[PDB]
């Protein structure tokens, strides 16, 4: 199976994301400083374990080198002060691009004012996310920071059908599309995340990714970790039951041609990389029948066996 | 995914196998008395710990009840004497259908001859397998036993690519093919296993399953356990890395619409069931988008959350 639209392949500070299935390895996006992360003692002041944070980033680099799966760090914060310090640390202690991420839009906006229109911010900071309820002050903050890449959260609790993401992105009736909104903020590269409600609905998320890649060619991915962590019946079972259940959820979108996964807490990277690399390897081996050419020699198929 | 051909759904003594993606849960097939199975004290005579064997069968039934994934037991033997006793034990100690399985055709035929004409055997025993080395003696032994279901195994190093495996199944030039051979033995129900040459080529196995379901509508599955166990680089990493890699390999065919998985030793059932149930749940949630109706309420989607 191949997509009709020519696929966007973005180069975000060296990380290739997008393409036809089997062309590029899955980009894996691990969360750091999330709510309840044990390496954060004060989520308001941003007091965190610098040694432990560095160890997670070094582990991510090592797993990436082993499998060929590139990484983007999901940097979460509950306050402007905290998220600013987290981003300053991430900039210094890895080369990877990263999501500027918060539940609260004003935390993302405040952090951007602090980080400013730094050329490094423009190259490495991906805004997470341009969502249905975006504000003009949010677009102003993105434009003033000169960001070029954003996650487009193409989710609406009233665009549940995959096909309805066309309306969300392009606009409909009197409603500006999320792509138009992003472009007004000066965004040039769009990572489309159709959103995940629960584990089962990951199949609708993946169909939405397929619609977006088929018709627009934007890189498609999703964030199933919250749904997996709300699955107490599985998580309480411990090893290896939680990990293989998680593996089934995180690999599923990749089996249908998705480009990136937000796999949740970085502490899970060791098993997530091994599962995702396995799926990537099997998909790319199908290239030998389809004629799709791998865009890089740094691919699980050439590395994990 | 929805498959072109009208799908064959077989009722093998109460186990539903086949159909469109999300119609029926994955049938899981665990191996017992395999080479080096430590509950066997004498593999030539078929002497084994019956309590340990029963404990495995009870565990399978408990896991099946939990997820709604039906089970068929893969009964392996290295001698006629041993495989005959194993089949006798399985008939009395579970209600499940089972594969009569040996790497040696002489062992399968010998064991089958010992079982004679038995309606319970005819309902529950699946011949594993009709493969490239089949003989008229073997087809005659199957017909004499009155078997109605067989695994059709297209594992051949003369048939690497999916279309070559289809040629082995459907026939080509001077060869009737494995399905035609099975029909001459009186087989009316075909569990098509294209074989797994290695881990990466599980995508080729899955493409062969797709062509089978697309064109013939026969249930399709595979046995990737041997390939995964021979993956030294991943196996060397231990738990849970080996299990999540295994889960990625075993779930991949299911994500592409496969009907059954031989997951290897039954001792791995606890994590295999959890991984496969997860995939099944996501696929069945897709049913509205595919135009499919669940054929049973005994489905992971309605059980595991």
Numbering used by the authors:
A (entry chain A), B (entry chain B): 2 to 306
Authors' description from the paper:
During energy production in Desulfitobacterium hafniense, MtgA catalyzes the methyl transfer from methylcobalamin (Cbl‐CH3) to THF in the catabolism of glycine betaine (GB). The topology of each subunit is characterized by a funnel of eight parallel β‐sheets connected by α‐helices on the outside that form a complex of two perpendicularly oriented TIM barrels. The active‐site cavity is located inside the hydrophilic core of each barrel.
Apart from snapshots of individual reaction steps of MtgA, structure‐based mutagenesis combined with enzymatic activity assays allowed a mechanistic description of the methyl transfer between Cbl‐CH3 and THF.
